[PDB]
């Protein structure tokens, strides 16, 4: 490996250890600088985004530049240490992704990282997937079927009564529209260890428009809200390891997402 790649890997391992030691709530910014305001200042070394006129400082575990880090590289370089740790420790875990524009490519990249035929995860586990969508008004949809689902809160998990697929060859086992993208998407992946049923559960939560993000904010930081969506989010935050990912590519919405990033890292930790 190149000097930079060696240094990156070493750094991400050390960063993850510090986060564990400090009991910090993981919150990462994945940013499209070229589509954000020119007066926003980015410190990619220290993980800081500063509003140039208000002078307000917003910190993150890391600020990741999308022009440098593709979605595939996000998973292999930036996310994999956390992912590997949660699997190794057999800790149910999540990735909660906030976006204000369609982000199907991230979903696609996630599944490929986990479950392509050639991943280490396929060597060690049989991998399943469910994918549902919860709408404000309410509505629910099983995303693995045509245009419905039920949720059951267990001691340490969320049971989805929805179509479950066993993934052999990544995206090939999923619908042709899988990577097409108010409410919340929920992808639940189970990792069943080979030659051992008891899985490690992973939840990928998509809040991919401002209304959905605001519902999260209201239902978690403002309101005891008891909507299906609020109950899911509360359950995951309390009972699984979390990783918040804030996708910043939208000038009109960036300030609200920065505010939320502060609540995530101060009101949950």
mmCIF file of C-alpha atoms in Angstrom:
data_model
loop_
_atom_site.group_PDB
_atom_site.id
_atom_site.type_symbol
_atom_site.label_atom_id
_atom_site.label_comp_id
_atom_site.label_asym_id
_atom_site.label_seq_id
_atom_site.Cartn_x
_atom_site.Cartn_y
_atom_site.Cartn_z
ATOM 1 C CA UNK A 1 0.000 0.000 0.000
ATOM 2 C CA UNK A 2 0.953 3.620 -0.646
ATOM 3 C CA UNK A 3 2.221 5.773 2.215
ATOM 4 C CA UNK A 4 -1.068 7.694 2.359
ATOM 5 C CA UNK A 5 -3.192 4.499 2.373
ATOM 6 C CA UNK A 6 -1.057 3.027 5.178
ATOM 7 C CA UNK A 7 -1.393 6.230 7.191
ATOM 8 C CA UNK A 8 -5.162 6.374 6.539
ATOM 9 C CA UNK A 9 -5.771 2.813 7.775
ATOM 10 C CA UNK A 10 -3.673 3.350 10.896
ATOM 11 C CA UNK A 11 -5.452 6.641 11.613
ATOM 12 C CA UNK A 12 -8.971 5.248 11.217
ATOM 13 C CA UNK A 13 -8.169 2.402 13.628
ATOM 14 C CA UNK A 14 -6.836 4.894 16.200
ATOM 15 C CA UNK A 15 -9.807 7.238 15.696
ATOM 16 C CA UNK A 16 -12.261 4.431 16.305
ATOM 17 C CA UNK A 17 -10.440 3.437 19.499
ATOM 18 C CA UNK A 18 -10.590 7.022 20.821
ATOM 19 C CA UNK A 19 -14.306 7.174 20.065
ATOM 20 C CA UNK A 20 -14.817 3.952 22.021
ATOM 21 C CA UNK A 21 -12.747 5.249 24.951
ATOM 22 C CA UNK A 22 -14.637 8.579 25.111
ATOM 23 C CA UNK A 23 -18.134 7.017 24.723
ATOM 24 C CA UNK A 24 -18.697 9.497 21.901
ATOM 25 C CA UNK A 25 -21.764 9.342 19.651
ATOM 26 C CA UNK A 26 -20.461 8.860 16.097
ATOM 27 C CA UNK A 27 -21.383 11.693 13.725
ATOM 28 C CA UNK A 28 -19.650 12.101 10.384
ATOM 29 C CA UNK A 29 -20.129 14.715 7.670
ATOM 30 C CA UNK A 30 -19.869 13.535 4.069
ATOM 31 C CA UNK A 31 -19.692 16.739 2.083
ATOM 32 C CA UNK A 32 -19.887 18.007 -1.501
ATOM 33 C CA UNK A 33 -17.843 21.196 -0.962
ATOM 34 C CA UNK A 34 -18.290 22.410 -4.547
ATOM 35 C CA UNK A 35 -22.088 22.490 -4.067
ATOM 36 C CA UNK A 36 -22.001 24.128 -0.645
ATOM 37 C CA UNK A 37 -21.697 27.838 0.214
ATOM 38 C CA UNK A 38 -18.287 29.427 -0.394
ATOM 39 C CA UNK A 39 -18.331 30.973 3.102
ATOM 40 C CA UNK A 40 -18.514 27.544 4.738
ATOM 41 C CA UNK A 41 -15.019 26.616 5.922
ATOM 42 C CA UNK A 42 -13.897 22.990 5.933
ATOM 43 C CA UNK A 43 -11.168 21.606 8.140
ATOM 44 C CA UNK A 44 -10.687 18.054 6.838
ATOM 45 C CA UNK A 45 -7.792 17.348 9.240
ATOM 46 C CA UNK A 46 -9.617 18.289 12.449
ATOM 47 C CA UNK A 47 -13.189 17.527 11.378
ATOM 48 C CA UNK A 48 -14.587 21.032 11.580
ATOM 49 C CA UNK A 49 -17.133 22.941 9.482
ATOM 50 C CA UNK A 50 -17.307 26.637 10.358
ATOM 51 C CA UNK A 51 -19.999 29.083 9.224
ATOM 52 C CA UNK A 52 -17.984 32.036 7.883
ATOM 53 C CA UNK A 53 -20.316 34.874 8.888
ATOM 54 C CA UNK A 54 -21.926 33.563 12.097
ATOM 55 C CA UNK A 55 -18.499 32.157 13.048
ATOM 56 C CA UNK A 56 -20.281 29.053 14.457
ATOM 57 C CA UNK A 57 -18.096 25.933 14.818
ATOM 58 C CA UNK A 58 -19.541 22.495 13.980
ATOM 59 C CA UNK A 59 -17.350 19.504 14.809
ATOM 60 C CA UNK A 60 -17.641 15.914 13.584
ATOM 61 C CA UNK A 61 -15.666 12.755 14.178
ATOM 62 C CA UNK A 62 -14.474 13.309 10.606
ATOM 63 C CA UNK A 63 -15.432 15.551 7.660
ATOM 64 C CA UNK A 64 -15.160 13.518 4.493
ATOM 65 C CA UNK A 65 -14.850 15.131 1.052
ATOM 66 C CA UNK A 66 -16.997 13.387 -1.572
ATOM 67 C CA UNK A 67 -14.834 14.685 -4.457
ATOM 68 C CA UNK A 68 -12.000 12.673 -2.885
ATOM 69 C CA UNK A 69 -13.958 9.745 -1.382
ATOM 70 C CA UNK A 70 -16.510 7.903 -3.578
ATOM 71 C CA UNK A 71 -19.327 5.978 -1.908
ATOM 72 C CA UNK A 72 -17.456 2.682 -2.371
ATOM 73 C CA UNK A 73 -14.347 4.216 -0.720
ATOM 74 C CA UNK A 74 -16.507 5.647 2.069
ATOM 75 C CA UNK A 75 -17.406 2.117 3.066
ATOM 76 C CA UNK A 76 -13.974 0.507 2.666
ATOM 77 C CA UNK A 77 -11.926 3.400 4.116
ATOM 78 C CA UNK A 78 -14.131 5.414 6.431
ATOM 79 C CA UNK A 79 -16.812 3.025 7.701
ATOM 80 C CA UNK A 80 -15.158 -0.410 7.739
ATOM 81 C CA UNK A 81 -13.316 -0.081 11.081
ATOM 82 C CA UNK A 82 -16.606 0.616 12.903
ATOM 83 C CA UNK A 83 -18.406 -2.104 10.935
ATOM 84 C CA UNK A 84 -15.708 -4.699 11.598
ATOM 85 C CA UNK A 85 -15.645 -3.828 15.298
ATOM 86 C CA UNK A 86 -19.414 -4.219 15.714
ATOM 87 C CA UNK A 87 -19.352 -7.599 13.941
ATOM 88 C CA UNK A 88 -16.291 -8.784 15.900
ATOM 89 C CA UNK A 89 -17.907 -7.760 19.195
ATOM 90 C CA UNK A 90 -21.285 -9.203 18.132
ATOM 91 C CA UNK A 91 -22.953 -5.848 18.853
ATOM 92 C CA UNK A 92 -26.144 -4.992 16.983
ATOM 93 C CA UNK A 93 -25.480 -1.743 15.207
ATOM 94 C CA UNK A 94 -26.634 0.879 12.764
ATOM 95 C CA UNK A 95 -25.872 3.450 10.128
ATOM 96 C CA UNK A 96 -28.290 6.385 10.240
ATOM 97 C CA UNK A 97 -27.916 8.414 7.046
ATOM 98 C CA UNK A 98 -29.397 11.928 6.673
ATOM 99 C CA UNK A 99 -29.704 13.327 3.156
ATOM 100 C CA UNK A 100 -31.776 16.058 1.521
ATOM 101 C CA UNK A 101 -31.580 14.637 -2.019
ATOM 102 C CA UNK A 102 -32.063 11.135 -3.482
ATOM 103 C CA UNK A 103 -29.192 8.934 -2.305
ATOM 104 C CA UNK A 104 -29.714 5.486 -3.872
ATOM 105 C CA UNK A 105 -26.032 5.267 -4.792
ATOM 106 C CA UNK A 106 -25.092 5.147 -1.086
ATOM 107 C CA UNK A 107 -27.538 2.294 -0.544
ATOM 108 C CA UNK A 108 -26.096 0.457 -3.571
ATOM 109 C CA UNK A 109 -22.540 0.965 -2.308
ATOM 110 C CA UNK A 110 -23.471 -0.247 1.156
ATOM 111 C CA UNK A 111 -24.892 -3.528 -0.125
ATOM 112 C CA UNK A 112 -21.882 -4.137 -2.365
ATOM 113 C CA UNK A 113 -19.506 -3.497 0.561
ATOM 114 C CA UNK A 114 -21.393 -6.010 2.713
ATOM 115 C CA UNK A 115 -22.520 -8.678 0.384
ATOM 116 C CA UNK A 116 -20.809 -8.986 -2.993
ATOM 117 C CA UNK A 117 -19.726 -12.633 -3.567
ATOM 118 C CA UNK A 118 -16.086 -11.671 -2.864
ATOM 119 C CA UNK A 119 -16.409 -9.867 0.474
ATOM 120 C CA UNK A 120 -14.892 -11.122 3.667
ATOM 121 C CA UNK A 121 -18.378 -10.851 5.185
ATOM 122 C CA UNK A 122 -19.770 -13.433 2.753
ATOM 123 C CA UNK A 123 -16.909 -15.772 3.754
ATOM 124 C CA UNK A 124 -17.818 -15.593 7.421
ATOM 125 C CA UNK A 125 -21.616 -15.142 7.362
ATOM 126 C CA UNK A 126 -24.830 -15.915 5.592
ATOM 127 C CA UNK A 127 -26.346 -12.478 5.003
ATOM 128 C CA UNK A 128 -30.039 -11.552 4.847
ATOM 129 C CA UNK A 129 -31.801 -8.322 3.955
ATOM 130 C CA UNK A 130 -35.187 -6.691 4.453
ATOM 131 C CA UNK A 131 -36.102 -3.212 3.232
ATOM 132 C CA UNK A 132 -39.207 -1.268 4.202
ATOM 133 C CA UNK A 133 -40.357 2.346 3.953
ATOM 134 C CA UNK A 134 -42.373 4.137 6.648
ATOM 135 C CA UNK A 135 -44.320 7.252 5.639
ATOM 136 C CA UNK A 136 -45.458 10.057 7.958
ATOM 137 C CA UNK A 137 -49.154 9.712 7.115
ATOM 138 C CA UNK A 138 -50.053 6.163 8.138
ATOM 139 C CA UNK A 139 -48.190 4.634 5.187
ATOM 140 C CA UNK A 140 -45.818 1.648 4.861
ATOM 141 C CA UNK A 141 -44.273 -0.197 1.922
ATOM 142 C CA UNK A 142 -42.302 -3.422 1.521
ATOM 143 C CA UNK A 143 -39.510 -2.276 -0.799
ATOM 144 C CA UNK A 144 -38.680 -5.858 -1.807
ATOM 145 C CA UNK A 145 -42.166 -6.288 -3.312
ATOM 146 C CA UNK A 146 -44.455 -4.305 -5.639
ATOM 147 C CA UNK A 147 -46.331 -1.190 -4.442
ATOM 148 C CA UNK A 148 -48.214 -3.723 4.177
ATOM 149 C CA UNK A 149 -45.400 -4.303 6.690
ATOM 150 C CA UNK A 150 -45.442 -4.693 10.478
ATOM 151 C CA UNK A 151 -42.837 -3.933 13.150
ATOM 152 C CA UNK A 152 -42.269 -5.848 16.378
ATOM 153 C CA UNK A 153 -40.006 -4.478 19.104
ATOM 154 C CA UNK A 154 -38.026 -7.256 20.737
ATOM 155 C CA UNK A 155 -35.744 -7.015 23.781
ATOM 156 C CA UNK A 156 -32.665 -6.114 21.683
ATOM 157 C CA UNK A 157 -33.938 -6.000 18.069
ATOM 158 C CA UNK A 158 -36.666 -4.809 15.718
ATOM 159 C CA UNK A 159 -38.558 -7.545 13.880
ATOM 160 C CA UNK A 160 -39.760 -6.646 10.421
ATOM 161 C CA UNK A 161 -42.722 -8.540 9.054
ATOM 162 C CA UNK A 162 -41.657 -8.008 5.456
ATOM 163 C CA UNK A 163 -39.992 -9.922 2.642
ATOM 164 C CA UNK A 164 -36.583 -11.327 3.589
ATOM 165 C CA UNK A 165 -33.935 -12.251 1.028
ATOM 166 C CA UNK A 166 -30.785 -14.284 1.549
ATOM 167 C CA UNK A 167 -28.030 -12.525 -0.421
ATOM 168 C CA UNK A 168 -25.571 -14.775 -2.309
ATOM 169 C CA UNK A 169 -24.214 -12.374 -4.940
ATOM 170 C CA UNK A 170 -24.738 -8.804 -3.716
ATOM 171 C CA UNK A 171 -27.141 -6.644 -5.719
ATOM 172 C CA UNK A 172 -28.039 -9.604 -8.005
ATOM 173 C CA UNK A 173 -30.346 -11.061 -5.356
ATOM 174 C CA UNK A 174 -32.185 -7.789 -4.892
ATOM 175 C CA UNK A 175 -34.865 -6.153 -7.036
ATOM 176 C CA UNK A 176 -33.869 -4.316 -10.182
ATOM 177 C CA UNK A 177 -35.152 -1.085 -8.608
ATOM 178 C CA UNK A 178 -33.263 -1.553 -5.337
ATOM 179 C CA UNK A 179 -30.913 1.397 -5.895
ATOM 180 C CA UNK A 180 -33.680 3.807 -7.003
ATOM 181 C CA UNK A 181 -34.398 6.612 -4.477
ATOM 182 C CA UNK A 182 -41.779 12.069 3.822
ATOM 183 C CA UNK A 183 -40.761 9.103 5.950
ATOM 184 C CA UNK A 184 -37.915 6.738 6.648
ATOM 185 C CA UNK A 185 -36.301 3.797 4.920
ATOM 186 C CA UNK A 186 -35.215 0.849 7.059
ATOM 187 C CA UNK A 187 -32.858 -1.823 5.811
ATOM 188 C CA UNK A 188 -32.246 -4.653 8.255
ATOM 189 C CA UNK A 189 -29.329 -6.977 7.536
ATOM 190 C CA UNK A 190 -28.699 -10.121 9.597
ATOM 191 C CA UNK A 191 -25.247 -11.710 9.714
ATOM 192 C CA UNK A 192 -25.495 -15.433 10.607
ATOM 193 C CA UNK A 193 -22.085 -16.900 11.417
ATOM 194 C CA UNK A 194 -21.156 -19.911 9.303
ATOM 195 C CA UNK A 195 -20.458 -23.282 10.926
ATOM 196 C CA UNK A 196 -22.115 -22.445 14.246
ATOM 197 C CA UNK A 197 -29.754 -19.391 14.637
ATOM 198 C CA UNK A 198 -28.242 -16.268 16.215
ATOM 199 C CA UNK A 199 -27.340 -13.278 14.047
ATOM 200 C CA UNK A 200 -25.718 -9.886 14.512
ATOM 201 C CA UNK A 201 -28.254 -7.286 13.359
ATOM 202 C CA UNK A 202 -27.396 -4.199 11.332
ATOM 203 C CA UNK A 203 -29.873 -1.396 10.537
ATOM 204 C CA UNK A 204 -29.415 1.126 7.745
ATOM 205 C CA UNK A 205 -31.775 4.039 8.288
ATOM 206 C CA UNK A 206 -32.394 6.496 5.434
ATOM 207 C CA UNK A 207 -33.828 9.903 6.232
ATOM 208 C CA UNK A 208 -33.454 11.324 2.747
ATOM 209 C CA UNK A 209 -35.415 14.582 2.695
ATOM 210 C CA UNK A 210 -35.653 17.613 5.024
ATOM 211 C CA UNK A 211 -39.139 16.756 6.261
ATOM 212 C CA UNK A 212 -37.980 13.278 7.322
ATOM 213 C CA UNK A 213 -34.892 14.742 9.021
ATOM 214 C CA UNK A 214 -37.061 17.246 10.895
ATOM 215 C CA UNK A 215 -39.379 14.466 12.043
ATOM 216 C CA UNK A 216 -36.288 12.743 13.466
ATOM 217 C CA UNK A 217 -35.268 15.989 15.155
ATOM 218 C CA UNK A 218 -38.754 16.638 16.586
ATOM 219 C CA UNK A 219 -39.405 13.041 17.614
ATOM 220 C CA UNK A 220 -35.954 12.534 19.220
ATOM 221 C CA UNK A 221 -34.746 15.911 20.553
ATOM 222 C CA UNK A 222 -37.932 18.017 20.903
ATOM 223 C CA UNK A 223 -40.994 15.935 21.901
ATOM 224 C CA UNK A 224 -42.048 11.039 24.284
ATOM 225 C CA UNK A 225 -43.206 10.640 20.665
ATOM 226 C CA UNK A 226 -44.755 7.259 19.851
ATOM 227 C CA UNK A 227 -45.116 7.159 16.048
ATOM 228 C CA UNK A 228 -43.623 4.012 14.391
ATOM 229 C CA UNK A 229 -40.745 6.181 13.110
ATOM 230 C CA UNK A 230 -39.969 7.735 16.508
ATOM 231 C CA UNK A 231 -40.163 4.325 18.195
ATOM 232 C CA UNK A 232 -37.701 2.813 15.670
ATOM 233 C CA UNK A 233 -35.215 5.675 16.098
ATOM 234 C CA UNK A 234 -35.485 5.636 19.884
ATOM 235 C CA UNK A 235 -34.981 1.874 19.946
ATOM 236 C CA UNK A 236 -31.903 1.985 17.730
ATOM 237 C CA UNK A 237 -30.267 4.865 19.584
ATOM 238 C CA UNK A 238 -30.840 3.237 22.985
ATOM 239 C CA UNK A 239 -30.159 -0.421 22.189
ATOM 240 C CA UNK A 240 -27.711 -0.603 19.259
ATOM 241 C CA UNK A 241 -24.352 0.967 18.421
ATOM 242 C CA UNK A 242 -24.907 4.048 16.235
ATOM 243 C CA UNK A 243 -23.151 5.842 13.408
ATOM 244 C CA UNK A 244 -24.749 9.061 12.138
ATOM 245 C CA UNK A 245 -23.854 10.113 8.614
ATOM 246 C CA UNK A 246 -24.811 13.623 7.486
ATOM 247 C CA UNK A 247 -24.713 14.039 3.724
ATOM 248 C CA UNK A 248 -24.183 17.720 2.987
ATOM 249 C CA UNK A 249 -24.666 18.615 -0.658
ATOM 250 C CA UNK A 250 -27.435 21.172 -0.467
ATOM 251 C CA UNK A 251 -26.832 24.827 0.382
ATOM 252 C CA UNK A 252 -30.427 25.670 1.348
ATOM 253 C CA UNK A 253 -30.540 22.900 3.968
ATOM 254 C CA UNK A 254 -26.977 22.861 5.300
ATOM 255 C CA UNK A 255 -27.529 25.094 8.354
ATOM 256 C CA UNK A 256 -30.358 22.921 9.766
ATOM 257 C CA UNK A 257 -28.272 19.774 9.259
ATOM 258 C CA UNK A 258 -25.339 21.429 11.065
ATOM 259 C CA UNK A 259 -27.663 22.266 13.973
ATOM 260 C CA UNK A 260 -28.868 18.653 14.111
ATOM 261 C CA UNK A 261 -25.274 17.423 14.064
ATOM 262 C CA UNK A 262 -24.714 19.327 17.324
ATOM 263 C CA UNK A 263 -27.781 17.760 18.991
ATOM 264 C CA UNK A 264 -26.702 14.272 17.915
ATOM 265 C CA UNK A 265 -23.291 14.700 19.557
ATOM 266 C CA UNK A 266 -24.445 16.454 22.767
ATOM 267 C CA UNK A 267 -27.915 15.135 23.649
ATOM 268 C CA UNK A 268 -27.343 11.395 23.085
ATOM 269 C CA UNK A 269 -23.678 10.526 23.823
#
